[PDB]
Design a protein around this ligand. Structure first.
Ligand SMILES: OC[C@H]1O[C@@H](O[C@@H]2[C@H](O)[C@@H](O)[C@H](O[C@@H]3[C@H](O)[C@@H](O)[C@H](O)O[C@@H]3CO)O[C@@H]2CO)[C@H](O)[C@@H](O)[C@H]1O
Ligand code: CA
Length: 386
């Protein structure tokens, strides 16, 4: 069925990554994954066979209330990062450790200090950040994990760990980078931004990072085609960073919709009125979208090192008609994007929107955990379809 056009100029060592941070909370909710032969299999094995070479995991400092009730979103702490890391390593895939330096979702709107850092002055918060990263990386190495890359922050467009001043953010970037450098010289340090479509944003950020002497290897970007402008633009803003500053570049988070259907009863992020949808909302469309983002980063040349698909397997804990039954699983295991317990930390967003998966229709597995044809995109970019 599926067609993929060969990506031209694609380097043989290109990073083909997935962020599957929700996997632990989902397996705990009784969710199962399959190979294309239709038998139960560890998702990491199926990912490997599909030609994935890299796993990304989000790390929240303390994603739990005082009583240890998970904030949800996969309840992603260091302990789960090690679980995920061990499995990735066991399956021949390198790890990208994605430190949010927050107790919950870090994005362009939300960059809240971890609860433990809330009353620290800047010096002490900075050494806490450095100390946390170093300790976290030591634990992962101790677990035998193959770490390829560390992301110091996540979509830090406007802040980091409670800080909004770019001179302060830069010192924080350097605190984390320092920990990585001390751990292993071979680990790539990524910084991760989003909204590449914004006029002169990435030029400004890269210049600011340079002026503040931030030590990093990779300038990473999000790319969701619904809001983030053109592939031509993406290539262009990343090429400018690569050429001007001598940085590697990559896409740290990308996805597309394979269906318009909501598989679990919790409203999905996309597709929606007003979003740019250049591809059909189908398995083929989804594969086109992934192949094209890979093309756009490859087109950067030497410096374009990879693409990570964000959450290819945040599938339903159960069908949409059993919404209220699903809610119990989301609430107990944190297998939706947020639980009600996160209202303490994030009242404005998680407080009003808490629930299930907002991205089940952007998975590369169906609602029942079988791989979609579009999962083959990681192999077929090298060769094209027959
Ligand atoms: O469910 C339909 C509604 O979804 C709302 O989106 C919610 C939050 O506003 C949104 O921030 C959250 O996104 C999560 C996280 O904050 C973000 O950084 C990451 O990329 O995605 C996470 C979810 O996968 O998602 C929830 C979804 O309930 C919309 O704001 C609203 O318009 C409506 O469609
Ligand atoms: Ca949903």
């Amino acid at each position: 069925g599926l067609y993929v056009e060969k990506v031209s100029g694609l380097r043989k060592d290109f990073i083909k990554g997935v962020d599957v941070s929700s996997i632990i909370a989902l397996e705990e909710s009784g969710v199962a994954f399959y190979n294309e032969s239709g038998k139960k299999q560890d998702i990491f094995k199926t990912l490997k066979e599909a030609g994935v070479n890299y796993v990304r995991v989000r790390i929240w400092n303390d994603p739990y209330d005082a009583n240890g009730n998970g904030y949800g979103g996969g309840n992603n702490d260091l302990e789960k990062a090690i679980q995920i890391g061990k499995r990735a390593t066991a399956n021949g895939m390198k790890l990208l450790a994605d430190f949010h330096y927050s107790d919950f979702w870090a994005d362009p709107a939300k960059q809240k200090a971890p609860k433990a850092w809330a009353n620290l002055n800047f010096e002490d918060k900075k050494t806490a950040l450095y100390q946390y990263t170093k300790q976290s990386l030591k634990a992962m190495k101790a677990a035998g994990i193959d770490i390829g890359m560390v992301q110091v922050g996540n979509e830090t467009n406007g802040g980091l760990a409670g800080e909004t001043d770019w001179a302060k953010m830069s010192q924080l970037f350097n605190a984390g980078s320092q920990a990585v450098r001390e751990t292993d010289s071979n680990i790539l340090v990524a910084l991760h931004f989003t909204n590449p479509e914004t006029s002169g944003r990435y030029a400004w950020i890269a210049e600011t990072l340079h002026r503040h002497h931030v030590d990093y290897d990779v300038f990473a970007s999000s790319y969701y085609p619904f809001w983030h402008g053109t592939l031509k633009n993406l290539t262009s803003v990343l090429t400018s960073v690569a050429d001007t500053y001598g940085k590697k570049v990559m896409v740290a988070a990308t996805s597309y919709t394979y269906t318009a259907e909501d598989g679990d009863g919790h409203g999905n992020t996309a597709p929606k009125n007003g979003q740019t949808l250049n591809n059909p909302v189908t398995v083929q469309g989804q594969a086109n979208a992934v192949r094209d983002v890979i093309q756009a980063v490859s087109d950067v040349g030497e410096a374009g090192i990879g693409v990570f698909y964000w959450e290819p397997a945040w599938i339903p804990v159960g069908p949409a008609h059993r919404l209220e039954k699903n809610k119990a699983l989301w609430e107990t295991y944190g297998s939706g994007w947020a639980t009600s317990y996160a209202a303490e930390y994030d009242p404005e967003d998680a407080g009003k929107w808490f629930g299930g998966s907002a991205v089940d229709n952007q998975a590369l597995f169906d609602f029942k955990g079988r791989p979609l044809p579009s999962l083959h995109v990681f192999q077929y970019v090298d060769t094209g379809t027959p």
